[PDB]
Amino acid sequence: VSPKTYKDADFYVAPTQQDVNYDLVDDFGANGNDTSDDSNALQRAINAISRKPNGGTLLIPNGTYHFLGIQMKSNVHIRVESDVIIKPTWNGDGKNHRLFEVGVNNIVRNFSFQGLGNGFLVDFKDSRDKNLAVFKLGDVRNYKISNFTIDDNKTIFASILVDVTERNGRLHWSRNGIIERIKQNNALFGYGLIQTYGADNILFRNLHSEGGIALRMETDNLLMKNYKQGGIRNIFADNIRCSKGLAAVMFGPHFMKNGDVQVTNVSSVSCGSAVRSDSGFVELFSPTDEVHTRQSWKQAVESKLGRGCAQTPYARGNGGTRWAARVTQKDACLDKAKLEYGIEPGSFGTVKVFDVTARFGYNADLKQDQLDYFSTSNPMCKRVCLPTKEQWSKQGQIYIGPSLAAVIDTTPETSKYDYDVKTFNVKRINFPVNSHKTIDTNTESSRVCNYYGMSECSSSRWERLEHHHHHH
Ligand SMILES: [Ca+2]
Ligand code: NI
């Protein structure tokens, strides 16, 4: 079997007309030389540009800029010179920030943002703000974002949120685009370069995440739960790479029913696996006017579903009055929950991954529920470490240690909502004897690691100091 082919114009069509072309410093008064905020300048430039029926280009010239919460607009095409450094402007209000928002609070049509030459840098290393994404996308169509390195500091926040937004009683999200030639350094395990929530006809290409997951197809979030709208469809990716992370490519549908995805050329070095699949699952949320306790919400649920059909309900945020519970993964329970609440576990349609190469290493991101898969090849749990509380205060959520497999697949969960990640020409390099090529639901495991008394990771290892950057 052969992969499906395509051309860049299938996703993104560049402008044929242009009314204006400006320079961020010369025309708008950005200062590339001090540490002042350049947000106003950038936005004034963007605004002036979208004013014109055919828009135009704005050049961001060499220098160091500070931007935050900028609002993109239709028919603006930003070009960024290769010695630019972009930094998040400081904001101490403790909320979730992004450098750039595309179709989040408006509607955006023909838009691009491109590094020239060898690419530029977004730098988070000196930021005091932990809550940062580079781009958040909503209602945007026909776009290209392209060319740069993100120097992260394990912030909370996939860097690029291919996300939904809410306008006039429905959800909206991005249709045709390309996101390509981006490297991320020093990402947090539970995050990475791309996270997708709602997406039609998007090409993801030449993307690399150091840590976490490069292409996270984990389709979750409030608005989609509530509106029963969103998810991803007809996604193409090529050249997805992981280093010192969980996975290059990950499928995790949650509650959303997703479309088709095709991936070619997946590589990883020193990651959990090159490809990862999770089963879908259902959470039932208690009503927002009823006052509930954990035990009362479990009871409402076991009442309609059965003894044993609810998992341990957790708290909705702070408050303590609103509750959510996972339906147990048993066809029976899942069946009644379908009949009774009209909702089921999520899945993906046709999924094909071509050319997967996983190179063994010693510094993968590892989840605690994966450690027992070392039983066959690493029966003394060598080279696995626990991060200190200063490094990560919820000890046991993340470990650093040897690669486990080419492909991890937890999808066999359930009967009716199972989905099929087809993989082709899968290779491993330098895995030890008795190790796993695929890990699934049936794979034999057995505790060999000290979960909470094993030795702790050096600062050097946690902070990836051995990696001297050369994007310079
Ligand atoms: Ca400045
Ligand atoms: Ni760097």
Side-chain angles (χ1 to χ4, degrees):
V1 74
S2 326
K4 278 160 69 211
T5 54
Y6 53 79
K7 70 176 166 305
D8 291 3
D10 288 324
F11 309 93
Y12 171 75
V13 187
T16 323
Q17 260 143 21
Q18 161 170 332
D19 293 342
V20 90
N21 73 318
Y22 295 130
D23 177 287
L24 190 59
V25 186
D26 293 347
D27 290 297
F28 287 99
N31 185 339
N33 278 333
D34 62 15
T35 57
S36 60
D37 199 350
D38 308 290
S39 288
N40 288 346
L42 179 49
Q43 193 72 64
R44 277 195 299 110
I46 280 158
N47 289 354
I49 283 167
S50 189
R51 249 304 251 194
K52 299 279 191 182
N54 297 118
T57 66
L58 163 78
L59 173 81
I60 299 176
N62 284 332
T64 293
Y65 305 88
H66 287 75
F67 301 138
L68 204 72
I70 276 105
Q71 307 298 123
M72 301 307 180
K73 291 204 174 205
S74 306
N75 312 299
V76 176
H77 302 272
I78 295 162
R79 291 167 80 78
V80 188
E81 275 173 9
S82 78
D83 263 287
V84 170
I85 309 175
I86 282 159
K87 295 195 184 172
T89 308
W90 165 253
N91 184 328
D93 70 26
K95 311 161 208 292
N96 299 325
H97 302 132
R98 16 270 164 175
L99 281 61
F100 315 115
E101 300 189 298
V102 192
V104 181
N105 301 121
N106 65 9
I107 293 169
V108 174
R109 288 306 173 257
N110 309 287
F111 160 81
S112 79
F113 198 106
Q114 297 192 74
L116 301 174
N118 286 0
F120 62 94
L121 180 78
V122 177
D123 189 16
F124 290 167
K125 293 195 302 298
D126 50 339
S127 185
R128 338 170 39 174
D129 203 342
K130 315 191 200 272
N131 311 105
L132 287 171
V134 169
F135 287 86
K136 173 185 212 214
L137 319 193
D139 197 343
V140 58
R141 312 230 178 152
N142 192 38
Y143 62 104
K144 198 183 189 218
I145 299 179
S146 207
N147 208 55
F148 54 97
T149 297
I150 299 159
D151 257 11
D152 198 340
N153 191 20
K154 295 188 171 78
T155 63
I156 296 296
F157 333 97
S159 292
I160 295 195
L161 304 166
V162 185
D163 207 331
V164 295
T165 195
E166 185 218 305
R167 203 176 60 257
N168 322 339
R170 54 133 14 210
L171 295 192
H172 307 78
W173 55 85
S174 66
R175 281 209 71 114
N176 330 280
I178 305 172
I179 302 160
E180 68 178 345
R181 330 234 339 268
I182 307 149
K183 171 71 191 278
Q184 185 158 338
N185 291 126
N186 206 10
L188 194 53
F189 74 84
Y191 303 107
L193 188 25
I194 308 304
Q195 188 158 354
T196 73
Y197 301 95
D200 295 294
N201 189 60
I202 308 296
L203 176 63
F204 299 96
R205 172 167 71 190
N206 289 255
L207 310 171
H208 181 183
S209 191
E210 171 180 73
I213 297 185
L215 184 60
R216 192 190 275 280
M217 296 169 291
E218 212 182 345
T219 46
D220 107 292
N221 94 352
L222 191 57
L223 269 39
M224 289 196 162
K225 184 80 185 70
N226 297 357
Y227 285 74
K228 296 170 165 215
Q229 282 174 351
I232 65 161
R233 260 151 262 106
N234 310 312
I235 308 300
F236 286 93
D238 177 51
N239 207 358
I240 311 297
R241 193 176 164 67
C242 166
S243 41
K244 288 173 193 165
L246 297 162
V249 163
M250 176 265 197
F251 296 93
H254 288 246
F255 51 80
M256 301 303 281
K257 171 162 175 306
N258 300 283
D260 294 339
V261 189
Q262 168 177 286
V263 184
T264 51
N265 186 5
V266 173
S267 60
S268 75
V269 50
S270 195
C271 313
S273 82
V275 173
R276 178 178 130 189
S277 293
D278 310 340
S279 185
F281 64 82
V282 280
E283 291 178 339
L284 301 163
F285 283 25
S286 68
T288 17
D289 358 81
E290 292 184 7
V291 147
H292 272 282
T293 201
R294 171 174 290 147
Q295 23 291 304
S296 61
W297 185 228
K298 191 212 208 55
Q299 214 59 26
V301 164
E302 309 257 297
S303 195
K304 277 167 172 192
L305 265 55
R307 86 291 130 215
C309 287
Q311 295 290 111
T312 312
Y314 61 76
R316 276 311 275 176
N318 213 47
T321 339
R322 51 278 308 275
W323 297 80
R326 269 184 59 146
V327 177
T328 305
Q329 293 292 79
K330 217 183 120 94
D331 295 331
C333 303
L334 252 8
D335 249 11
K336 331 233 195 69
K338 179 44 189 176
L339 305 160
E340 197 71 42
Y341 296 98
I343 67 181
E344 58 183 63
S347 69
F348 272 101
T350 315
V351 182
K352 285 196 191 66
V353 192
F354 294 84
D355 308 314
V356 182
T357 296
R359 179 179 289 276
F360 185 76
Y362 292 108
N363 308 122
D365 283 344
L366 300 172
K367 299 294 292 198
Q368 184 178 271
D369 68 10
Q370 291 159 351
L371 304 170
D372 307 348
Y373 301 119
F374 279 119
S375 63
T376 51
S377 82
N378 192 7
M380 303 182 181
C381 189
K382 266 149 185 165
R383 321 277 306 248
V384 185
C385 65
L386 178 66
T388 72
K389 81 197 188 54
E390 290 79 15
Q391 298 154 182
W392 188 257
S393 69
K394 311 288 183 65
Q395 301 201 94
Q397 283 197 331
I398 183 67
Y399 291 80
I400 296 168
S403 289
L404 282 165
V407 174
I408 294 169
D409 191 317
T410 261
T411 210
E413 240 152 84
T414 85
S415 76
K416 316 194 182 203
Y417 327 85
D418 154 64
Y419 66 92
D420 198 47
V421 180
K422 286 157 185 284
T423 65
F424 308 84
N425 177 35
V426 176
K427 317 178 238 31
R428 290 183 306 155
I429 305 159
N430 236 37
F431 277 68
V433 295
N434 293 322
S435 50
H436 302 294
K437 189 191 170 149
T438 313
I439 282 158
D440 63 32
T441 299
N442 283 107
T443 310
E444 69 173 316
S445 59
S446 188
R447 182 160 170 186
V448 297
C449 294
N450 193 336
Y451 303 149
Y452 304 100
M454 73 172 57
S455 61
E456 302 175 315
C457 314
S458 59
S459 273
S460 169
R461 199 180 178 182
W462 174 258
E463 329 200 353
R464 308 172 176 117
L465 263 32
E466 302 266 80
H467 181 194
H468 316 273
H469 288 188
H470 306 304
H471 53 78
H472 283 66

